Amino acid sequence: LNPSCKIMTFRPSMEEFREFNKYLAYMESKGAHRAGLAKVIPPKEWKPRQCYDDIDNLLIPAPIQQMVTGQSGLFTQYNIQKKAMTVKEFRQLANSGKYCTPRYLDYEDLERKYWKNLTFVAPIYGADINGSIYDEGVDEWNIARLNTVLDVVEEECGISIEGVNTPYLYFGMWKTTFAWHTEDMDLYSINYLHFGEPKSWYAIPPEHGKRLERLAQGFFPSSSQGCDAFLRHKMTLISPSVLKKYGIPFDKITQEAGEFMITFPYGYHAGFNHGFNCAESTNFATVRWIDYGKVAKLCTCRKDMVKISMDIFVRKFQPDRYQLWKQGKDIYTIDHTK
Ligand SMILES: [Cl-]
Ligand SMILES: [Cl-]
Ligand SMILES: [Cl-]
Ligand SMILES: [Cl-]
Ligand SMILES: [Fe+3]
Ligand SMILES: [Zn+2]
């Protein structure tokens, strides 16, 4: 049941691990989803790539420098496009004195340092590189093809998933931020940290998502007047000190190399990288998502955003509600625990 909605860590055996879709179902049966985020640590024998040495030669065609502005736990961010570089160049940049992780005592100490130094040197990341770095033939937890209900409708019904169910690579350095968001269409996400330094995550229970939104609206009124789903721009930073102060429940956890993090529908999350690293991610869905997708608040201020038609999912997996829904009389409030 997980009534504290705390972030759960799972440690499957090889036998439990083999089949992603079954294990996700297990995780939700233990209440993992209530926290909005969960960690899965695979068995020690499982290795998605034998050698990472080659990844040095990969090009980051569009690195981004993150420009953070604000104070006292509230910040807005904008991006500057830098020249293309290799991962090798990026790593060497990341480990230089200008950009390297500071000295610290423990993860709590480093967390304080992140929030206290956000507006000094601007860090650089590489994101949204199409690709997977799993070895060929690795069939467990293959982010390139998890084969969820998103793939079923794409392949069997010719519906466009708008590229969200394909794999992306991310290269972080110290202090790179991921601002507060839920996923496109409030889908699930999965993130595997291949190598390098840890990522720290914050998550807010889906049952408190609307409360985070109301608070963001209060503190970032101009951003809000501009877009009904502005947090989707991923440019809004809010510190845990502010969340505590205004009564928004949340939890944090640190993801180490070799660990998966899964985000759940409408689980607001954010975080920062500890240092040079490489991660791979994608979006996916289950039947339980369909109700969130149907009510997802979309970005109303630029046409280059992801919108997926929910018609097929309702027709196929909610046939008893389809007519009602097309009448615009399928009105409900989601029970996030169930
Ligand atoms: Cl230092
Ligand atoms: Cl620093
Ligand atoms: Cl499903
Ligand atoms: Cl049908
Ligand atoms: Fe995310
Ligand atoms: Zn917008």
Distance 109 CA to ligand 1 centre (A): 12
Rounded to whole angstroms, the Cα distance separating 3 from 321 reads 30
Picking from 198, 242, 254, 213, the residue whose alpha carbon sits closest to that of residue 75 is 242
Which residue, chain included where needed, has tokens 């625990």? Answer: 337
Annotated binding site for Fe cation: which residue ranges? Answer: 181, 183, 269
- Residues that place a CB less than 5 A from ion ligand 3: 286-287
**AA identity, residue 12:** P
**AA identity, residue 140:** E
Question: In b/e form, how buried is each residue of 202-228, taking b as 16+ CB within 10 angstroms?
Answer: bbbbbbbbebbbebbeeebeebbeebe
Report helix, strand or coil for 217: helix
Q: Which ligand is nearest to the CA of 232?
A: 6
Token pair for residue 23?
Answer: 């294990």
Triad 237, 335, 154: Cα angle to 5°? 75
Do residues 52 and 88 make contact, with C-beta atoms less than 8 angstroms apart? no
Alpha helix stretches (DSSP H) within 18-148: 20-29, 87-94, 107-117
First to last CA, the chain: 9
**Cβ–Cβ contacts within 10 Å for residue 115, how many?**
16
**Pairing between β-strand 59-60 and β-strand 8-10 as defined by DSSP bridges:** unpaired
**Pairing between β-strand 37-40 and β-strand 8-10 as defined by DSSP bridges:** parallel
Length of the chain, in residues: 338
Do residues 46 and 166 make contact, with C-beta atoms less than 8 angstroms apart? no
Rounded to whole angstroms, the Cα distance separating 197 from 157 reads 41
Distance 332 CA to ligand 1 centre (A): 52
In this structure, what are the phi and psi dihedrals at residue 90, rounded to the nearest 5 degrees? -65, -40
Distance 154 CA to ligand 6 centre (A): 26
Which residue, chain included where needed, has tokens 């963001």? Answer: 216
For the annotated catalytic residues, the residue numbers are 163, 170, 181, 183, 269, 281
Strand arrangement of the beta sheet that strand 8-10 belongs to: 8-10, 37-40, 260-263, 188-196, 277-284, 168-172, 124-130, 64-71, 74-81, 236-238
Rounded to whole angstroms, the Cα distance separating 285 from 150 reads 6
Query: Residues with Cβ < 8 Å from 25, sequence gap 6 or more?
Result: 286
Do residues 40 and 16 make contact, with C-beta atoms less than 8 angstroms apart? no
Picking from 126, 142, 233, 147, the residue whose alpha carbon sits closest to that of residue 184 is 233
Rounded to whole angstroms, the Cα distance separating 20 from 27 reads 10
Annotated binding site for 2-oxoglutarate: which residue ranges? Answer: 125, 191, 199, 234
Do residues 174 and 99 make contact, with C-beta atoms less than 8 angstroms apart? yes
**Pairing between β-strand 85-86 and β-strand 37-40 as defined by DSSP bridges:** unpaired
In this structure, what are the phi and psi dihedrals at residue 125, rounded to the nearest 5 degrees? -130, 165
**AA identity, residue 194:** H
Annotated binding site: which residue ranges? Answer: 125, 181, 183, 191, 199, 227, 233-234, 269, 299, 301
- Residues that place a CB less than 5 A from ion ligand 4: 315
Distance 98 CA to ligand 2 centre (A): 9
**Cβ–Cβ contacts within 10 Å for residue 300, how many?**
12
The counts of H helices and E strands in the chain are 11, 16
For the chain, which domains are there?
A: 7-338 (2.60.120.650)
Residue 46: is it exposed, middle or buried by C-beta count within 10 angstroms (0-12/13-18/19+)? middle
Token pair for residue 203?
Answer: 């998550």
Do residues 237 and 17 make contact, with C-beta atoms less than 8 angstroms apart? no
107 Cα distance to chain centroid: 20
Distance 291 CA to ligand 4 centre (A): 18
Please tell me the chain's helix, strand, coil percentages from 3-state DSSP, rounded to the nearest 5: 30, 25, 45
Rounded to whole angstroms, the Cα distance separating 37 from 8 reads 8
Q: Which ligand is nearest to the CA of 120?
A: 2
Picking from 266, 272, 201, 216, the residue whose alpha carbon sits closest to that of residue 75 is 216
Token pair for residue 20?
Answer: 């992603």
Distance 262 CA to ligand 5 centre (A): 9
